Amino acid sequence: AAAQAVCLAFNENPEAVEPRVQAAIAAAAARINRYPFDAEPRVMRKLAEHFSCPEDNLMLVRGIDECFDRISAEFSSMRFVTAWPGFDGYRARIAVSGLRHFEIGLTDDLLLDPNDLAQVSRDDCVVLANPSNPTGQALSAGELDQLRQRAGKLLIDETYVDYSSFRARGLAYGENELVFRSFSKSYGLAGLRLGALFGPSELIAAMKRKQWFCNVGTLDLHALEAALDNDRAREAHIAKTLAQRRRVADALRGLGYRVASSEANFVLVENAAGERTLRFLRERGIQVKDAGQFGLHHHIRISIGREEDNDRLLAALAEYSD
Amino acid sequence: AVCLAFNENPEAVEPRVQAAIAAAAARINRYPFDAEPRVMRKLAEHFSCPEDNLMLVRGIDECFDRISAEFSSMRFVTAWPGFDGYRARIAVSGLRHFEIGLTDDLLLDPNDLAQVSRDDCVVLANPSNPTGQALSAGELDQLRQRAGKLLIDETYVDYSSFRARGLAYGENELVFRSFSKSYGLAGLRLGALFGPSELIAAMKRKQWFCNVGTLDLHALEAALDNDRAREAHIAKTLAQRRRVADALRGLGYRVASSEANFVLVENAAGERTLRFLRERGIQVKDAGQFGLHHHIRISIGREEDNDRLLAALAEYSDH
C-alpha cells in the first residue's frame, strides 16, 4: 500500500495515452526531417469530416492564445469584453496588445451580471468560455440570445463542451460569431496545445493568410489525426468523468463543503480557510487549483481524475472537515 | 520521387531522436511544465550563451514577426532577389520596405547598400537563399555601422566556411539559427533567435503559452545531443555539393558558387527543364519564386539522389 502524488489542478485527461495514438507518433518520428506537405491537407480534411463542416470554415491553431491573437488582430479597434471572474488567458493576451477592455462581473450565483451584460454594444467583441472556467457554469438561452442581439462580434470558447449537457447542439458560427474547440481535455493532447477555430469563410481565409508556415509540425499533425479516430476511448473518458464529477460533488456536500454545479471536468468549492487548505492537501501530496488566479479568491477548483485519484482527494478533505 | 527542391536533410532520423519522441508520446496528455525550462537550458548549453539571450521560435516567420512588432516605425530592408519569406511577413504587417538588389555576380548592390540608414532594420540571409552567396567582411562592416538594427538569418551556416565564427549579437544585432537543415527537424519548423537580453525578454512575453509542445521539445532536446550524425551529414553535403557543381559545369551548365546545401544553376530553357526532370521523377526549385527567373535551385541530397540528378541533366545536356 503506497499512496503516491495526485494532481487534480490543470484539468488534464488522466487516462493513459491510447496505444494506436502513440504508434502514429512513433511512425511520424521517422519523417521529422521532411516538411509535412502531404500530412497538413490530409489532417485539415480529417478535421472537416470530424466536425462535419467545410474546411473553409475551420482553422487549426496553437490553442486559445493563437485563436485570441489572430481574431483580435482583425478587430483591433473594437472593445474586447470578457468575464471576470473567469478564464485569465484573455487578460494575458489583452496585456500583450493595445486593445480596449471591459469586463462582465458575476452574481453571487456565479452567473453573468445582467447590469454589465446590458453594457454590451455593437462596437464590442465578446469572448466568453461556455462552460466557464473555473465556475463550470453554462450560458443560458437568454444570455446567448441577448449577446447575439447586442454584440458586434462573439467568440464562444467551448474548451469544456465535451463534459456538458449541450453536446448535441451544433457548432454555432456565422457572419458575426465564431466558436473555439480544444484538443487538450477530452481528446488528451494537452501537451501539444492544439485547437480548432470555426467561423465565416472570408474571415477564416484572411487569418489563415497571416498564420506561420508549417505552424503545426508533422508529430503534432499525426498525433491529432490519431486522436480524431479515437471516439471509443474519448466517450469512455467523458462517461467516467460525468459519473466521478457526480460522486465527488455529492460526497463533498455530504462532508459539509459548498460545491458549485459544473458542466466541465472539475468542481468549484468554497474555501474560506484560504492557503491553510492548499498547504494541508500539499502535505498529503494532493495538488488542487487556487481559483484566486481567476478572481475567485477563497475558492478551489478541483479537477476530476481517475477513481483512485478522486478517492485520495475525498479521504483528505474528509479528514480536513474535522 | 527524388525531392531536391526544399533543402531538406535527406538522412534517416537517428534512433535516439525517434526513441525520445516515442517516450514523450506516453505523456502528451500533460502540459510539459518541466520539459520547457529543461530544453531552454539545453539550448543555452548547446549555443554556449545565457538563456536570457535566446528565444525558441516557430521558424523564421515567428522570428520576423516578433522582431518587427518591436521596431514597427523602422524601414525594413531585405535583399531582392533573395528569400521571399520576409516579403510575405511585411505584407501581413504593412511595414515600410526598401529592397537591396543584386549585381550580375549575385552580390549585394553597393548603390542600394549605400542607402541603408540608422532608421533601417536590415534583415539578410547569410549564406543567402537561393544564390548561396555569403556576406563579405566589407558588407558586414558597412551594415554594422550604417544600420539601426540588423538581423542575420544563418539558416544555412552549417554548410558554410565560417562555422568557427559563432554567434554575433549585441545592442543592435540579432542572429537566427534554424533546426530544419543540418539538425534534420524541417517537419517541426523550429528555430533559435539570439539577441540582447532586454529585447529578448520583451519578445518572450508576447509568445503563446506552450508555443512548442512536448513532442517537438523532446525531439529538439535529443537532436542537440547528436553531433556525430550532424557532422557526418555536413561533411557528405560539402563533398556531394563539390561533385554536383563540378559535374554540371563539365556538362556545360553555369553553376554559381555556394556556401549552402544547394546550387543555383542558369536555366534559359525555363519550364522545359523542370518538365524534363519531373518526367524522370526529379523535383527541383524554380528560382523565379525569389526573383531569379530562368534559374533553378538544386538541393544537394544523398549520393543516390545526386546520381539520378546528374544522369538526367547529362541526358538533357544533349536534347
Automatic annotation (TrEMBL), chain B:
Name of the protein: Aminotransferase
One record GO biological process: L-histidine biosynthetic process
InterPro entries named among the record's database cross-references: Aminotransferase_I/II_large, HistidinolP_aminotransfase, NHTrfase_class1_PyrdxlP-BS, PyrdxlP-dep_Trfase, PyrdxlP-dep_Trfase_major, PyrdxlP-dep_Trfase_small
The keyword Transport is assigned to this record: no
Pathway: Amino-acid biosynthesis; L-histidine biosynthesis; L-histidine from 5-phospho-alpha-D-ribose 1-diphosphate: step 7/9
GO molecular function annotations of the record: histidinol-phosphate transaminase activity; pyridoxal phosphate binding
Native organism: Burkholderia pseudomallei (strain K96243)
Phylogenetic classification of the source organism: Bacteria, Pseudomonadati, Pseudomonadota, Betaproteobacteria, Burkholderiales
EC numbers: 2.6.1.-
SUPFAM superfamilies linked: PLP-dependent transferases
Chain ranges of the Aminotransferase class I/classII large domain: 4-313
Catalytic activity: L-histidinol phosphate + 2-oxoglutarate = 3-(imidazol-4-yl)-2-oxopropyl phosphate + L-glutamate
